[PDB]
Write a protein that binds this ligand. Sequence first.
Ligand SMILES: COC(=O)c1cccc2[nH]ccc12
Ligand SMILES: COC(=O)c1cccc2[nH]ccc12
Ligand SMILES: COC(=O)c1cccc2[nH]ccc12
Ligand SMILES: COC(=O)c1cccc2[nH]ccc12
Ligand SMILES: [N+]
Ligand SMILES: [N+]
Ligand code: NA
Lengths: 303, 302
Amino acid sequence: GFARLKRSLLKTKENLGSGFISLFRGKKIDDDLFEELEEQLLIADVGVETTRKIITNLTEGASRKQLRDAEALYGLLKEEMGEILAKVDEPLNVEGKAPFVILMVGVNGVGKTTTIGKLARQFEQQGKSVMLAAGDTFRAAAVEQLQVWGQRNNIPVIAQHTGADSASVIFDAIQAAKARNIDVLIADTAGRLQNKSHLMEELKKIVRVMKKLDVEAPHEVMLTIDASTGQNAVSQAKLFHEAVGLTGITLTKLDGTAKGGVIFSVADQFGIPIRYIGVGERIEDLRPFKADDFIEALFARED
Amino acid sequence: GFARLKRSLLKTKENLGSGFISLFRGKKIDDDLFEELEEQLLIADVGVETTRKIITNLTEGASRKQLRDAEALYGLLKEEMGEILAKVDEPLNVEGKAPFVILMVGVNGVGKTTTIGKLARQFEQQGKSVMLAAGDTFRAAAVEQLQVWGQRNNIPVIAQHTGADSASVIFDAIQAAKARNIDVLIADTAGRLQNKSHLMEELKKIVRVMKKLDVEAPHEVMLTIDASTGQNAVSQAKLFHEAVGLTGITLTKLDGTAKGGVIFSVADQFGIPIRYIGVGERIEDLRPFKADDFIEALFARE
Ligand SMILES: COC(=O)c1cccc2[nH]ccc12
Ligand SMILES: COC(=O)c1cccc2[nH]ccc12
Ligand SMILES: COC(=O)c1cccc2[nH]ccc12
Ligand SMILES: COC(=O)c1cccc2[nH]ccc12
Ligand SMILES: [N+]
Ligand SMILES: [N+]
Ligand code: NA
């Protein structure tokens, strides 16, 4: 519930949300204050451009409202930062397709594989049938890990030999899922970053091949990024958004990091819906993102 | 988006907003349709006159564009109902007064006392000093409760003996608030249901006595009404508005009632800013009313 969400964000709340209260207590609204607040936002990984927007809007709103007390900045900041997250607060709906195809993109080692498993279990718990495609075809250990997980959870995993063509594996998986009236297909992909131009090509190849079987596929292109990696997450988002058309973002490992500010940078810089946030180890701790619950937990205060 | 507001509005969305979607599915635009729509608005507690206005504008707007599929009324209805709420979209500003005096009026048992406490905590979290006046002077248990609350929250509460003259308590509270550099004074009042002319004269007396200390007081005359009381909320607004001039409204208990559509009747009939809506038990759940947020949650497909 909500109480677990608050507890999971305590390290980010040191600096953001309720963490602002001690910064404002008894201060004057002046440049020294906005400079300290700028610094605190940047340290939290909110990012130069998004921080500049927040500070600018706050400065203007403070003047317009003729505020006297720095404590009164808290509500204006909660509105400003809430608005950033509200603009990307569109939940993923996987209903009504045969299969709904999720193309999972992102670097290796940011919770991409974990997210695939948790989403698969959530959809199954909802009464949907799920299939996986082991599209990261040149990493033999990762394929075998998806297969073993599929074998442990009674979920089919389509896979070919090491070095198979990723687009062919995923083509075969869509074909299989359509014939078995599978509700949701979740397709892994390679996450090696060196060749940006290569990445755009392998992903564009995957998408084109998909569309030979279903012009609507992929129905979702989901990036996974790790919030504890700070601005590396922002740069990955930039890379994959320019590389392929993203329609959804999952941000993992929000719990236990003081770098939870990166969600605001991702929301503001890209405007792509944030579908899920990972706030713990449990299957259900991959939460459908709710901007309002998120903001309330971050800004929760009991004074 | 707006997941928490959608849930607080779940019962209201059965009849309004997204609840229109099933009503229009696959229908043609004709008299039967507008009749079905009028019925659903009335069931949603939008009120006879406000419903007639909506249906009128919708009809003519539908003929002009020669619309045929009832599905196309949805966007027009969202505009019409959004315009109604946008007219009372104006957040309360309490800055710059010494003190800013809020006179809290309404009947007992509609969230008036809860609203006082939530506002007080919000203003103190904003860096303001707050004081309360226990003006509901013949209800000894209500007064003592307010005092105990003030003691728990380190907020002063001005009170006199049971049966004291409410105008005297509030006069003394303004005097104390001015001496103590209080930023916001929130004055409770009686909300007993019998002898409504009696209560109205008491309120006018309170206002006249306040003005002995500050002719701008009360800076806000706030009605509290409970959305679960449906059209009784509208009749309460009319009564209190006629006796003293309301300047703001707080509509409580939107969560869990199917009659949240009464907000449109309140907005349309009086044109008084709705400052706050109560959408849950938390201090933060007394939310500043933002009309576009409310419409989006109501009319959202998802
Ligand atoms: C909870 O962690 C997982 O879901 C998981 C762990 C190890 C391998 C996995 N492969 C897919 C999900 C998964
Ligand atoms: C076996 O055929 C495939 O896996 C395949 C892969 C990529 C494009 C394709 N087009 C037809 C089959 C096919
Ligand atoms: C925050 O809740 C209240 O406003 C409240 C709860 C219980 C008793 C109260 N008395 C005044 C406010 C109040
Ligand atoms: C205790 O209240 C007063 O002293 C009082 C009440 C109503 C009108 C008043 N005018 C001057 C004092 C006063
Ligand atoms: N009172
Ligand atoms: N009293
Ligand atoms: Na959302």
